Amino acid sequence: GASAWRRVRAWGPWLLGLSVAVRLAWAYLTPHGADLVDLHVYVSGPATLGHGNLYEFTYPPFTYPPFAAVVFWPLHLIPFTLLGLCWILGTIAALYAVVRLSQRLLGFDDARAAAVWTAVTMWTEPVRSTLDYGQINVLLMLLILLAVASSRWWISGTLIGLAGGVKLTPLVSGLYFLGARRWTTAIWAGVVFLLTVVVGIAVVGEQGRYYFTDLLGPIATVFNQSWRGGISRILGHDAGSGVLVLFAYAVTAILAFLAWRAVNDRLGQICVVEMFGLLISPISWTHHWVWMVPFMVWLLHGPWRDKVGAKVFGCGWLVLLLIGVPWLLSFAQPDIRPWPLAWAGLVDIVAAIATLTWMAVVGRRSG
Amino acid sequence: DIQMTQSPSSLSASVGDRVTITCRASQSVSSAVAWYQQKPGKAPKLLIYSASSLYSGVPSRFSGSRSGTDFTLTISSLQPEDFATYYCQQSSSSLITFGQGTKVEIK
Amino acid sequence: EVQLVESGGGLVQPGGSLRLSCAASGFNFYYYSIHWVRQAPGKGLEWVASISSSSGSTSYADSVKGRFTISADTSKNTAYLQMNEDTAVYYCARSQAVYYWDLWWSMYHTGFIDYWGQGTLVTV
């Protein structure tokens, strides 16, 4: 029984050190293995400063706030190969730090167990596809977790503001921070965000206002795993603000609220908040689902570890994420729908809905 | 090391009387303070933890504290005669220190 | 449910060594911490040592002569090993840790849960 689990993590560092060698070989020994198109867009964007426009840019477009351009400006000096070498190492280092933060938030620590966890979960579909393009999701997750784990107002506020300046999606953590009654954190984060907007306006040729105006002014693919994507896939035409999308998001709001009320610890609350944010977002690719690792760790090591439901859900989530159902379906997706194939693009949505319902019911029956 | 000081002067154990005990600390223990109750010949038992969080299952010692570098317990009633010895500690400096403080009944 | 039992009490001589044992039932050591507290006869409580049961043992106060190891998942054993102080009564208790990060990692303890154990009668 427990004898098998004990001896596996006694040699955590070399299984982490074994998968990294395979990961750094796949990129540098396969055709189209180390293109890093997103890192290319990140770097070759701020190069057009002092001449031309950063938004009249194409790469065989840059649609990030000017604060990101200011941040990435001191990156075109370094040769691209060295930066590409360092980026992946930073990514796995951030993942290891995230697992360590989750362990400490539970109430214990173990370096070997964290190494084994990172080695096992490095190849999950969201994490697997995250570092294929060169995205920055893991760093933002690490920043949010560091802000959550801290106890000082200024540290957390500055971390949240800086994380939300570069990308506009990780501003949903304010919902959790208001839920935990940690006031003045939202105020300091808002001040930091406004200073980031001001400096972005000042550094570039007043392009931030135009960027925000254009922001207000494909989604039918199978990679998009949000409500809008699934409704559009089933219907065949764009859903938008339809007569069922309001009910579809409506009932997910109430399920998320009930599930949040069920749990009464930091990691569970932040996991439910991030799941709600993932489900509500209009465009949420599969690489945005890197938040299922802390949720899995909470399922396996949290207070509810004594139930035989939590175990079933954890194992099912692990196998489902490892298999990668939408990636498999992507080979059948038409260019622009047979219903046995169109009805399978909602597996992650139904899994999340079932998890929310189960947590809500077990929270209700416990009073 | 962070020392502790109390005022072992509680007496007369009159039924329904209020109780106040002070644990005067040094340095900064932050909010990592707990209190215990022990009867003669028996092991102690936790009463209040986190310096402001009451436990689950203590009906006769419903109180709190201040957390402003000085800690008090408001034992509103003394119905079961609550004859025991109470202690305060800290668990912040990687070392744990205790105190004193008993209660006696009327003559 | 949760139980803690001690057995290593005796009448050791002024010089030598002895060991203690505090077993458990109904929970797992991987999520909690174990401490030992002693009390001289006619005096107050005094803390001796602390452990994490997941990473390692520290906090040996100033009379540093004990060992205080744990054999996790092997009969749920907690054992102390003294190389000599004075007559007292020793207890074993359980607690939980809380972590915080302010430019560096600091931690404290929640407080020993009501799951205490009865004492021993060691005597030099």
Author numbering:
A (entry chain A): 21 to 80, 89 to 245, 252 to 370, 375 to 405
B (entry chain L): 1 to 107
C (entry chain H): 1 to 84, 89 to 128
Sentences from the paper on this structure:
For structure determination, MaPimE was purified in n-dodecyl-β-d-maltoside (DDM) and reconstituted into lipid-filled nanodiscs. We evaluated eight Fab candidates for their ability to form stable complexes with MaPimE, and we selected Fab-E6 due to its high binding affinity. We collected 7469 micrographs of nanodisc-reconstituted apo MaPimE in complex with Fab-E6 on a Titan Krios transmission microscope equipped with a K3 direct electron detector. After further particle sorting and 3D refinement, we obtained a map with an overall resolution of 3.0 Å. We were able to construct an almost complete atomic model of PimE with the exception of 20 residues at the N-terminus and ten residues at the C-terminus, and three disordered loop regions (80–87, 246–250, and 369–376). The variable domain of the Fab was well resolved, allowing for reliable modeling. In contrast, the constant domain of the Fab was not included in the final model, due to the lack of well-defined density. The cryo-EM map reveals well-resolved density at the interface between the Fab-E6 heavy chain and the cytoplasmic loops of MaPimE. Only the heavy chain appears to contribute to the interaction interface, which is stabilized through hydrogen bonds between its complementarity-determining regions (CDRs) and the cytoplasmic loops that connect TM helices 2 and 3, TM helices 4 and 5, and TM helices 8 and 9 in PimE. We identified a prominent cavity within PimE, located at the interface between the TM domain and the periplasm.
